[PDB]
Amino acid sequence: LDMPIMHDSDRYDFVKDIGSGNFGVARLMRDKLTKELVAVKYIERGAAIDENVQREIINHRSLRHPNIVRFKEVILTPTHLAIIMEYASGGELYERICNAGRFSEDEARFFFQQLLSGVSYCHSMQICHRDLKLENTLLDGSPAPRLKICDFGYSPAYIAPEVLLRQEYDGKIADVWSCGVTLYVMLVGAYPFEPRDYRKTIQRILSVKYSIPDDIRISPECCHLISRIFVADPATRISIPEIKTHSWFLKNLPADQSLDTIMQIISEATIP
Ligand SMILES: [Co+2]
Ligand SMILES: [Co+2]
Ligand SMILES: [Co+2]
Numbered sequence: 001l002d003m004p005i006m007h008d009s010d011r012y013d014f015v016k017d018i019g020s021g022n023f024g025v026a027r028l029m030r031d032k033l034t035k036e037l038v039a040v041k042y043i044e045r046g047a048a049i050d051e052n053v054q055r056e057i058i059n060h061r062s063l064r065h066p067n068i069v070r071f072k073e074v075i076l077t078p079t080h081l082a083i084i085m086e087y088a089s090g091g092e093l094y095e096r097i098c099n100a101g102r103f104s105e106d107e108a109r110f111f112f113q114q115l116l117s118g119v120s121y122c123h124s125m126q127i128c129h130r131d132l133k134l135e136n137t138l139l140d141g142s143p144a145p146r147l148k149i150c151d152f153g154y155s156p157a158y159i160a161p162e163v164l165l166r167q168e169y170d171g172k173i174a175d176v177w178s179c180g181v182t183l184y185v186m187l188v189g190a191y192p193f194e195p196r197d198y199r200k201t202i203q204r205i206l207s208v209k210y211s212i213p214d215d216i217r218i219s220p221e222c223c224h225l226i227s228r229i230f231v232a233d234p235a236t237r238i239s240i241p242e243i244k245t246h247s248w249f250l251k252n253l254p255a256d257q258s259l260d261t262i263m264q265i266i267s268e269a270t271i272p
Contacts, residue, residue, distance in 0.1 A: 001017055001019055001025055002025060002044070003017065003027055003080070004042060004077040004080045004082075008075060010032075011032055012029035012030060012032060012038070013029060013030040013032060014027070014029055015029055015030055015037065021091070022039075022089075022091055022092060023039045023087070023088075023138075023150070024041075025042075025155070026039045026040060026041055027039070027040040027042070028040075028087060037087040038072055038084050038085065038087055039084070039085055039086070039087040040083065040084050040085075041085070041154040042081065042082055043080060043083070043154065043269075044079065044080055044272070045077075045078075045079060045081060045270070045272045046271070046272030047272070049270045052153060053154070054266055056152050056154070057074060057266060058262070059125075059127055059152075061257075061262060062125060063121070063125060063127070065118055065121045065122075066146065067114045067115070067117050067118035067146065067147050068118050068148065068150075069085050069086050069088060069138065069149065069150040070085060071084075071085050072085050072086065072257075073262075074257070074265045074266060074269075076265045076268055076269055080269075081265070081266065081269040083154055085150075088138035088139060088150070089141035090139030090140050090141045090142070090145045093134045093137040093139060093147070093182070094133075094134035094137075097134065097185060097186060102187060102188060102189035105187070105218070105248075106252060108183060108186040109249070109253060110144065111147055111186060112182070112183050113253060113254060114146065115137065115179055115182060116240055116243060116244070117256065118147065118149045119132070119149075119175055119240065122149075122175075123175070123240070128171030129169075129171030129172075129175065130149075130151045130175060130178075131158075132149070132158065132175060132179065133158055133178075134182065134185065136149060137149060137182065138150050156191070156193070156198060156201050156202075157181045157184075157185075157191040157193040157194070157201065157205065158178050159202075160174040160178070160234075161177075161205055161206050161208070161232045162174065169234065170234055173234040173237055174234070176229060176238065176240065176243075177229060177230070177237065180226060180229030183225075183226065183229070184210070184226060187216075187222070188213065188216065192230070193205045206232070208230050212226075221248040221251070222248045225243070225246050225248045228242075
């Protein structure tokens with residue numbers, strides 16, 4: 001695996017090297033003081049430490065929210081940049097939906113509320129146009145799992161119409177569309193604009209042609225909400241504040257390292 005020799009064993013115990021899963025290729029360590037598991041992602045020093053990686057780390061550091069994987073620290077290794085972060089031990093939302101087939105409206109609402117909380121928070125930090133696919137929606141190891149968005153660049157239905165049609169677009173409004181796809185898949189157990197023919201799906205996305213199968217019963221209020229997200233015109237698509245006052249959303253709803261140090265470490269990591 002593309003990882004350096006174990007390091008900083010004075011502060012971390014080595015647990016396991018992961019070749020696939022939740023965090024892709026990653027090393028699991030345990031913080032010696034707090035006893036919490038952390039995930040470590042590694043990037044080779046030099047050219048691979050590019051401006052987008054730098055930007056992503058800095059933005060990751062700024063994002064402090066219970067539904068976004070928490071940045072812990074960066075460490076310089078002789079061969080790699082180490083990016084340490086909160087570990088989420090419950091897999092990803094894709095796997096949970098797959099195992100369940102589909103969610104009840106209560107379970108969909110439980111995760112949707114958390115997703116919207118994370119997304120709304122990113123928007124307030126002027127971070128948007130994110131990759132909010134099911135695979136980047138991680139879960140912690142709680143019985144009622146806490147959702148943990150992890151979209152950071154450390155390695156079809158989701159694409160809104162305007163992203164295909166326009167060169168530039170409103171990233172926050174596009175994110176709302178993505179949130180709708182996640183809601184839909186949780187409720188239905190399949191993607192809204194689909195068998196495997198990309199062209200057909202893109203055509204369906206562009207003309208906003210989806211249908212909730214009769215096979216499953218969804219409340220009319222839930223149908224109305226989805227219909228307000230799957231709107232091709234970004235100007236009239238429902239906003240997150242409007243989602244949060246929608247009848248479906250409200251029903252049975254649960255209650256709602258120094259920067260200079262990081263810059264020096266990242267900067268030095270550019271030297272291979
Ligand atoms: Co975000
Ligand atoms: Co933005
Ligand atoms: Co991630």
